[PDB]
Design a binder for this molecule. Structure first.
Ligand SMILES: *C[C@](*)(O)[C@H](Cc1ccc(O)cc1)NC(=O)[C@H](CC(C)C)NC(=O)[C@H](CC(C)C)NC(=O)OCc1ccccc1
Lengths: 242, 233, 212, 244, 244, 241, 198, 250
């Protein structure tokens, strides 16, 4: 066949690229970073009315100051989260302090290219790249609120806002306009909620969508349905208002 | 042709080419531009940080390896991390064991040798990143260009990345000029920014988009970004 | 070291001394022999300083991971077994630590666990661990009632560690108190024996030996 | 590299099938038929020797019926060599169980272990599966008489009567036709011989082309006895049942 | 059929190893370099294409030393050349450590020989993309060697490889004939500088930089040293003169 | 030594080996599970390509991981054993260290990870198996029902099915299961289960086995008759119209 | 050592185990249950080195339970003891052996007979009418060698134990804080909560 | 480096065939003929010494090898594969039997060992099956005389007499005619020589033939005396001379 870590003539790694195609088929995930915190929202996307929508966990807590959202082959994200959580706790044990959001992200991305069948560089024993992308959002005393996009390519970017998954290119353009350096947390919440509504196939409600944020004061919290449902209502109203 | 000899690095084409290595090189080109130039007292790295969206950052392209050495990356970020890190250890080792700062020329040999290994054994893939190493050691200022092929060269100045050909011609001209910017850092830097702009086209180097690093006689390799470079735009 | 912890009607009381020695040299009289794993988990330290400090701090990190992983507070039983099982891995290597793990999960209620480097893990209502455990037991055993006021229980505790601080050459410094209700642990201050002794002597009439 | 010559023996077909297993089974289908019939007072194992000659030493021969334990025996269909590899490791497992619990290994426990080994070559390692199918005939104080069957896939099941190898579909129909729950060893012995007789790809069903074995609990005793019929014994029982 | 050229250790119908031959192509495509054996030592010289004015002159060195008496120069994939020297260096240290005496040139040759030949035995490795000229002075004379990607190597009076191996070889052959008594270290150094200049015609498009080194029992005490300053200029001129 | 990457991405972003693993699940016999208000039921169909088996000793489809948790599946039998085993071992290990039996979600999450792991490790193909894990968390009475698949994904269902014709029977359950009022009884819960199986089993008294799990390690399987009685009464619901 | 007694009567097996847990000069606990239930009809008591004791017990408990679920069947007492002996026998020749002695008492539902096994940390197994580990054996074997009859009822068995426990309280130097008794018969395992004065 | 051939080189084809085993058999079919006949008091194995040049010394090339003092083997197919097989066989006879029980292994077991080795070269990663078929003849106290044939597949069966290689079919037929369960060793040796003559194109004498027997004990070939229980090896290779003598009575 052809090496799992081969280069296309255009200078790209097939497996990583094909990996990205998979992520495109994933459920939408959006993150907005403001000076009042970072907001993370995701499209549950239950595949059947019998599936208990709240057993869908696409937003998880890395540490009290770091949380993340995933898109694509979500099963692949478990070991990533695990690695992340451990790295956070471990850092704290060794240094008596919180792991910087960028450092944590850098650590997760270090697993990215560790795949192959005998790649001369260490012991990269993983048959394929990860089929999921992550939005790592947190806060630290050095660079405040941060939003990161971690991909199977090993590279991670920092965004003020970012959308990944099925409705990404669409939602991304939206964020472009809507985002400004003085958004409030509440504005960002509604905003994410609105953009999810446009890209989602299903009619957004507090059951096929989930919000969450991370603020220096109370850290990472996942909004329980009731809390979100009202923001949904509040959004429909502000929209109908013009 | 090619299609049958580019399945992996361990294969030679009928003409003697290693396509996988070549495709790796192709990732460098697709990478943002960066430039390096040195006088006899300093060495400077001016790198153009590239952004995904206007909501995304301009991914850092300058890594410090030791107080007296650093480099700029053009290509796969992860690979630059791997390589920079390796260099950081070699520098560290040299200090701890011999209480000696690592010669820039030697750091180059180490990088070449490490890359070469991924081009002769099955399974591995070449590194998809280009590196520009600058440093001040026991023999003055130094500038190195590192190619994934394993080829490392020492120059007075140079550039790699997209449209890098602009800056490279400009410096091949400005040679006699900047090579004498001894004792003056701000000039060598300006001389660099004037080389990097020779490869622009899309936009103009903004503040949160320009990145410069310097090292020399009495300057521990340091990196400037944003406000720090404002006075160079 | 002297440390104690006992269960009673109002929850759990935990008292410890704060002296650290190396032979006959008194290296410190200001040591924190109690680690707060979390809002409802306390670990006491008796034995080798490094051993306790290091491994109990490590225990803390393990408890945190359990909570991130299971989205639920780790039980006092499981928290203690983790330390226990770890310490057992090193059995025979020389680790030295007499530990007490106290907490209050809704599932177990007030709970105290004794865990030492021999690999012994015991559940109980009363425990005194340390070079001065016998001195504490003497005072504590003879005044304990399940029905003590959170005020009295607290005192008895403080008084027992005081007892030990007096008779045990390797115990002393000050007393650190804690109370565990299902609303978590509640620090009840540090009481320097330097003054606590005389005060209790006068106000209590005990320590009737010493000339004051 | 070598990836060029790798047959990838452990992959799924677009239809969710395991090529190698399917082909291994295809191989098994050309193997001499083996039959196992379980009666109330015992189990019967009969097998047809694929290819033979005048010069072949049938006395010292064995290519289908192997004794695993004293209470368990198997009938083979496929690569004899592959079968022997599994037979031996099977024999070891039995002994470990004994040395550990001071009790003979329950029939299913042994069967599962062997089947698990097979399933292994099905999911990892990049090696070909074993081209073997077994009919296990055993007895234990928990389920008494038991009959099992395992194949390349690593799947195994229990039967009252079963066949493996060549013409199983034909043999199964014939068995499903004359089997009766209350049967008796002697009855099964005959049912077995008849079935083979009607599915053989040969002219006649002679003794020299057979292997026969029964596992009874000899009334005058109280314990289990495995009997592997000798050429002469087969020749007799062959005439008696009326096949001369 | 075909495809005998896609895997490294494969034999083609005519008994060749195409991958090794393709490696040679990479070699022929590289800079030219040579070696001249004289009456008490050896001289090495190589062409250094000046891709640009940015190349710090005299810096990017190519000739390498092994131990203290061996000099190595190669044409082809430079990184591969370094790799081969790193090995040789260890190969040498190992020898000295056990036998005390520094490794004899012939002995050293086979070390590199065997190692290179090794990379033509498996399809999991690529052959070396360089031809190497190396040598030095030992317990009994001076020795010049050239090693092919095939691992093949022989002793030479003069040797050359790379882009202008023919021009060189042509020149070398002249020398061999016009000096049956033996050239001198001083002589060879100039002669070499010339041959590089001549052989540079097959690449006359780009400007180059000369590099020479030598090991002479009398001129360097048997140690490998680079030709610098005056002696270098003197030889550069001796060539510049006869190039016209 | 064998580490060939058998599960890799294709141009469209699919891991064909995992995909084909699901095809093996579609082929396996059907399995279903519906949770009541105080119980969970697991029904499975029985093939008939060959009938003359010994039901006593032939391995049953519903397996006990611990005294309070069961696991049923659709797909390759051989493959399931490997998972059942691992689950059972992890179950004991968890008791040994945490001093408390596993929760259904935990045991499910573990099984799922094992599966996920086989999708991105060298030299191994994915498990051609999907499972339904159900039971009651320790000292809890709220029923739990989860499902896993080759990919390593897992979630909880009010009711679900896997295997051949699961398509059909899922519809039945989608328009027959009211989350508002779940089968408030073990009986009406078991009925809803058979009804859904009949949609596909096509009259199979001996081709249908049900298992009922109640709180506090109360697990029991129904015998032909008990089930046959449910079939009988149900066919009358039809004829009485 | 601690007190570990076992006595097999007519239709059951009785295990008596001391309740004290002493470390150094202090009696840390006086209600210790030096036993683990391996299966519904098999009980194992143990004594020995501080950590090894429970670790071993629980390790064996886990394995038997795993066997039970895998095979949906309860191993016979004989089989379980054979498993435990092999374990100890492997341990004795390992880097750091388990220093634990055990008594395995179970009711074999297939034979409908109680069984008592004594196995020491070396992997020395033996079946007996009655057994004990430690110094206790030095007083109880002759005691039982006198007052023991195979046909004794469970009740006669408990009186026989009381007689032993009294002899041990009289002559043994240590205060073992009484014992905990448990009965293993055709109906499982149950604990006599009233022995502190029966 | 490193054998990265960790997968099987022999696999099942859609038809159910195991190609490499088949091809290995084809290789055996081309090999020079060899046979074996079992008498009531001995066994005889023989083959043709197809010298590959008149300059080569046929002696320095035995196709008939002694595995144990009571077991000998001969083959048909690829000589080199045979050679290494004999080595492994001779060794396994010790490691797995003599060193454990203090006595040489009985014919069936040693054969069983060889068969195992061959079976593995049919499934192990990165190897091709053995291109040979063996005929092993031996004698052990509890099984008497026996003759076995081992194939590349690893399968083996006991024979009264049989032949492998080039003209096996023809030779097998000729044996069925002349064999009977009352043959004496000399009768079989004779019959052997006859059957072999049909398969030989050129010279047929004691120098172009290799024949050995498994018969009575040769205390003369023991090498020492003083131990009653040790009577000598039952395996003996016939000398070029001893053959010719029987050829004149052909
Ligand atoms: C009395 C308690 O055991 C006390 C527990 C404790 C916990 C945490 C911290 O930071 C301090 C103390 N520990 C000690 O008193 C113990 C002495 C006896 C073993 C009880 N002391 C040591 O652990 C000692 C503490 C240092 C001063 C930090 N560490 C040690 O290295 O001492 C061994 C020693 C060396 C030489 C002479 C005699 C003893």
């Amino acid at each position: 066949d052809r090496g799992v870590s081969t280069f296309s003539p255009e200078g790209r790694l097939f497996q990583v690229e094909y990996s990205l195609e998979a992520i495109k088929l994933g459920s939408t995930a959006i993150g907005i970073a403001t000076k009042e915190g970072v907001v993370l929202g995701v499209e549950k996307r239950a595949t059947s009315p019998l599936l208990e929508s709240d057993s869908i966990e696409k937003i998880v807590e890395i540490d009290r100051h770091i949380g993340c959202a995933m898109s694509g082959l979500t099963a692949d994200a478990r070991s990533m989260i695990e690695h992340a959580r451990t790295a956070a706790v471990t850092h704290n044990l060794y240094y008596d302090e919180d792991i910087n959001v960028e450092s944590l992200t850098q650590s997760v991305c270090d697993l990215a290219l560790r795949f192959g069948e005998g790649a001369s560089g260490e012991e990269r024993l993983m048959s394929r790249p990860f089929g999921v992308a992550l939005l790592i959002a947190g806060h630290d005393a050095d660079d405040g609120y941060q939003l990161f996009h971690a991909e199977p390519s090993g590279t991670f970017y920092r965004y003020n806002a970012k959308a990944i998954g099925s409705g990404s290119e669409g939602a991304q353009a939206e964020l472009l306009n809507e985002w400004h350096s003085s958004l409030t947390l509440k504005e960002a919440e509604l905003l994410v909620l609105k953009i999810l509504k446009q890209v989602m196939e299903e009619k957004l409600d507090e059951n096929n969508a989930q919000l969450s944020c991370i603020t220096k004061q109370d850290g990472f919290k996942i909004y329980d349905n009731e809390k979100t449902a009202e923001l949904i209502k509040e959004l429909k109203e502000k929209e109908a208002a013009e | 042709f090619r299609n049958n000899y580019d399945g992996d690095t361990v294969t030679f084409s009928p003409t003697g080419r290693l396509f996988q290595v070549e495709y790796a090189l192709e990732a460098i080109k697709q990478g943002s531009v960066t430039v390096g130039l040195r006088s006899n007292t300093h060495a400077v790295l001016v790198a153009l940080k590239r952004n995904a969206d206007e909501l995304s950052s301009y991914q850092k392209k300058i890594i410090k390896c030791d107080e007296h050495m650093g480099l700029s990356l053009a290509g796969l970020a992860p690979d630059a991390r791997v390589l920079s890190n390796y260099l950081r250890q070699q520098c560290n080792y040299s200090s701890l064991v011999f209480n000696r700062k690592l010669a820039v020329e030697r750091a180059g040999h180490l990088l070449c040798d490490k890359a070469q290994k991924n081009t002769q054994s099955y399974g591995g893939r070449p590194y998809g990143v280009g590196l520009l190493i600058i440093g001040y050691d026991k023999s003055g200022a130094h500038l190195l260009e590192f190619q994934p092929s394993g080829n490392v060269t020492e120059l007075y100045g140079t550039a790699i990345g997209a449209r890098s050909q602009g800056a490279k011609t400009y410096l091949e001209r400005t040679l006699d000029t900047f090579i004498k910017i001894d004792g003056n850092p701000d000039e060598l830097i300006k001389a660099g920014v004037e080389a990097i702009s020779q490869s622009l086209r899309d936009e103009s180097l903004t503040v949160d988009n320009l990145s410069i690093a310097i090292v020399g006689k009495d300057t521990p390799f340091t990196i400037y970004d944003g406000e720090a470079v404002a006075k160079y735009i | 070291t002297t440390t104690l912890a006992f269960r009673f009607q109002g929850g759990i009381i935990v008292a410890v001394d704060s002296r650290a020695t190396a032979g006959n040299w008194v290296a410190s009289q200001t040591v924190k022999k109690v680690i707060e794993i979390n809002p409802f988990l306390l670990g006491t330290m008796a034995g080798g300083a490094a051993d306790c400090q290091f491994w109990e701090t490590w225990l803390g990190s393990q408890c945190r991971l359990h909570e991130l992983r299971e989205k639920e507070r780790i039980s006092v039983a499981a928290a203690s077994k983790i330390l226990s099982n770890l310490v057992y891995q090193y059995k025979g290597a020389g680790l030295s630590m007499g530990t007490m793990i106290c907490g209050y999960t809704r599932k177990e209620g007030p709970t105290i666990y004794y865990v030492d480097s021999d690999g012994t893990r015991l559940k109980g209502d009363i425990f005194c661990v340390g070079s001065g455990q016998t001195f504490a037991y003497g005072v504590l055993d003879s005044n304990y009632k399940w029905d003590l006021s959170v005020e009295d229980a607290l005192y008895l505790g403080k008084r027992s560690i005081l007892a030990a601080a007096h008779r045990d050459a390797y115990s002393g410094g000050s007393v650190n108190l804690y109370h565990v209700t299902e609303d978590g642990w509640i620090y009840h201050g540090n009481h320097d024996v330097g003054e606590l002794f005389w005060k209790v002597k006068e106000e209590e009439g005990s320590f009737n030996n010493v000339i004051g | 590299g070598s990836r060029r010559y790798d047959s990838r023996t452990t992959i799924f077909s677009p239809e969710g099938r395991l090529y190698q297993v399917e082909y291994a089974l295809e191989s098994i289908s050309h193997a001499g038929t083996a039959i196992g019939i379980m009666a109330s007072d015992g189990i019967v194992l009969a097998a047809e020797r694929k290819v033979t000659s005048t010069l072949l030493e049938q006395d010292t021969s064995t290519e289908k019926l192997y004794k695993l334990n004293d209470k368990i025996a198997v009938a083979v269909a496929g690569l004899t060599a592959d079968a022997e590899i599994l037979i031996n490791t099977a024999r070891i497992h039995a002994q470990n169980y004994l040395k550990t619990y001071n009790e003979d290994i329950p029939v299913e426990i042994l069967v599962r272990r062997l089947s698990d080994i097979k399933q292994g070559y099905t999911q990892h390692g990049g090696l070909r599966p074993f081209g073997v199918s077994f009919i296990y005939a055993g007895y234990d104080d928990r389920y008494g008489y038991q009959l099992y069957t395992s194949n390349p896939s690593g799947n195994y099941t229990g039967w009252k009567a079963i066949s493996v190898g060549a013409n199983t579909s034909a043999a199964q129909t014939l068995l499903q036709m004359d089997y009766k729950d209350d049967m008796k060893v002697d009855d099964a012995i005959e049912l077995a011989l008849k079935t083979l007789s009607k599915t053989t790809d040969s002219s006649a069903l002679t003794y020299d082309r057979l292997e026969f074995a029964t596992i009874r609990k000899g009334a005058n005793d109280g314990e289990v006895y495995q009997k592997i019929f000798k050429p002469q014994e087969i020749k007799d029982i062959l005439v008696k049942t009326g096949i001369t | 059929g075909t495809g005998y050229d896609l895997s490294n250790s494969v034999f083609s119908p005519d008994g060749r190893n195409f991958q090794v031959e393709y490696a040679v192509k990479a070699v022929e495509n590289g800079t030219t370099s040579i070696g001249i054996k004289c009456n008490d030592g050896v001289v090495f010289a190589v062409e250094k294409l000046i891709t640009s004015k940015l190349l710090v002159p005299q810096k990017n060195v190519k000739i390498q030393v092994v131990d203290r008496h061996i000099g190595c120069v190669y044409s082809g994939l430079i990184p591969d050349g370094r790799h081969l020297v790193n090995r040789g260096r260890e190969e040498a240290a190992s020898f000295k450590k056990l036998y005390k005496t520094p490794i004899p040139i012939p002995a050293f040759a086979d070390r590199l020989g065997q190692y290179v030949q090794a990379h033509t035995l498996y399809n999991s490795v690529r052959p070396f993309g360089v031809s190497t000229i190396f040598g030095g002075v030992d317990k009994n004379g001076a020795h010049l060697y050239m090693l092919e990607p095939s691992g093949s190597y022989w002793g030479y009076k003069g040797a050359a490889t790379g882009k202008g191996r023919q021009s060189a070889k042509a020149e070398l052959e002249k020398l061999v004939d016009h000096h049956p008594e033996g050239l001198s270290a001083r002589e060879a150094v100039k002669q070499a500088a010339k041959i590089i200049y001549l052989a540079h015609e097959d690449n006359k498009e780009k400007d180059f930089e000369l590099e020479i080194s030598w090991c002479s029992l009398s001129e360097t005490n048997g140690l490998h040293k680079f030709v610098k300053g005056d002696l270098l200029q003197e030889a550069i001129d001796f060539a510049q003169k006869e190039i016209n | 030594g064998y580490d060939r990457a058998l599960s890799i991405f294709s141009p469209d972003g699919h891991i064909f080996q995992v995909e084909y693993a699901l095809e093996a699940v579609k082929r396996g016999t059907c399995a279903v599970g519906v949770k009541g208000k105080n119980c969970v039921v697991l029904g499975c169909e029985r093939r008939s390509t060959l009938k003359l088996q010994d039901t006593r000793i032939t391995p049953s489809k519903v397996s006990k991981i611990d005294s309070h948790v069961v696991l049923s599946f659709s797909g390759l039998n051989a493959d399931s054993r490997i998972l059942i085993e691992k689950a059972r071992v992890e179950a004991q290990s968890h008791r040994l260290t945490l001093e408390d039996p596993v929760t259904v979600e935990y045991l499910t999450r573990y099984v799922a990870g094992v599966q996920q792991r086989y999708t991105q490790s060298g030299g191994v193909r994915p498990f051609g198996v999907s499972t339904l894990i159900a039971g009651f968390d320790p000292r809890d009475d709220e029923p739990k029902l989860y499902q896993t698949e080759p990919s390593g994904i897992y979630s909880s269902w009010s009711a679900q099915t896997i295997g051949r014709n699961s398509k059909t029977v899922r519809e039945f359950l989608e328009k027959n299961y009211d989350r508002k009022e779940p089968p408030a009884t073990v009986e009406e819960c078991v009925k809803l289960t058979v009804r859904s199986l009949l949609e596909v089993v096509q009259t199979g008294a001996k081709n249908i086995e049900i298992t009922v799990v109640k709180p506090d390690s109360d697990i029991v399987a129904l015998s032909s008759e008990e089930i046959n009685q449910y079939v009988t009464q149900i066919e009358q619901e039809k004829q009485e119209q | 050592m601690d007190i570990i007694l076992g006595i097999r009567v007519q239709d059951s097996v009785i295990l008596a185990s001391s309740k004290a847990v002493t470390r150094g000069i202090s009696v840390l606990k006086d209600s210790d249950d030096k036993t683990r239930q391996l299966s519904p009809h098999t009980l194992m008591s143990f004594a020995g080195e501080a950590g090894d004791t429970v670790q071993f017990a629980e390790y064996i408990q886990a394995n038997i339970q795993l066997y039970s679920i895998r095979e949906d069947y309860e191993l016979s007492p004989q089989a379980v003891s054979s498993f435990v002996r092999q374990e100890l026998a492997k341990s004795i020749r390992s880097r750091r052996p388990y220093q634990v002695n055990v008594l395995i008492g179970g009711y074999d539902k297939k034979k409908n007979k109680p069984e008592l096994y004594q196995i020491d940390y070396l992997g020395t197994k033996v079946e007996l009418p009655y057994g004990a580990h430690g110094y206790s054996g030095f007083y109880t074997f002759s005691l039982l060698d006198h007052h023991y009859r195979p046909d004794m009822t469970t009740e006669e068995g408990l009186d026989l134990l009381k007689l032993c426990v009294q002899e041990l309280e009289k002559r043994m130097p240590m205060d073992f804080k009484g014992v905990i008794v448990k009965i293993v018969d055709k109906d499982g395992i149950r604990q006599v909560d009233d022995f502190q004065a029966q | 480096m490193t054998d990265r051939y960790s997968f099987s080189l022999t696999t099942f084809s859609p038809s159910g065939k195991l190609g490499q085993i088949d091809y290995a058999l084809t290789a055996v079919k081309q090999g020079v003929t060899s046979l074996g006949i079992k008498a009531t008091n001995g066994v005889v194995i023989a083959t043709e010494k197809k010298s590959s040049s008149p300059l080569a010394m046929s002696e320095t090339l035995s196709k008939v090898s002694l595995l144990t003092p009571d077991i000998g083997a001969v083959y048909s197919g690829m000589g080199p594969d045979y050679r290494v097989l004999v080595d492994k066989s001779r060794k396994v006879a010790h490691t797995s039997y003599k060193r454990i029980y203090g006595e040489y292994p009985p014919t069936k077991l040693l054969v069983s060992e060889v068969a195992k080795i061959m079976q593995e070269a049919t499934q192990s990663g990165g190897v091709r099956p053995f291109g040979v078929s063996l005929l092993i003849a031996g004698h052990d106290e509890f099984n008497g005389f026996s003759l076995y044939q081992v194939d590349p597949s690893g399968s083996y069966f006991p024979w009264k007499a049989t032949a492998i290689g080039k003209g096996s079919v023809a030779a097998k037929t000729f044996l069925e005619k002349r064999w009977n369960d009352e043959l004496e060793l000399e009768d079989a040796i004779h019959i052997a020589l006859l059957t072999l003559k049909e398969s030989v194109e050129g010279e047929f004498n004691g120098d172009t033939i290799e024949l050995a027997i498994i018969g009575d004990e040769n205390p003369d070939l023991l090498g020492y005396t003083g131990i009653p229980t040790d009577k000598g090896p039952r395996f003996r290779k016939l000398t070029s001379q001893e053959i010719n003598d029987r050829l004149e009575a052909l």
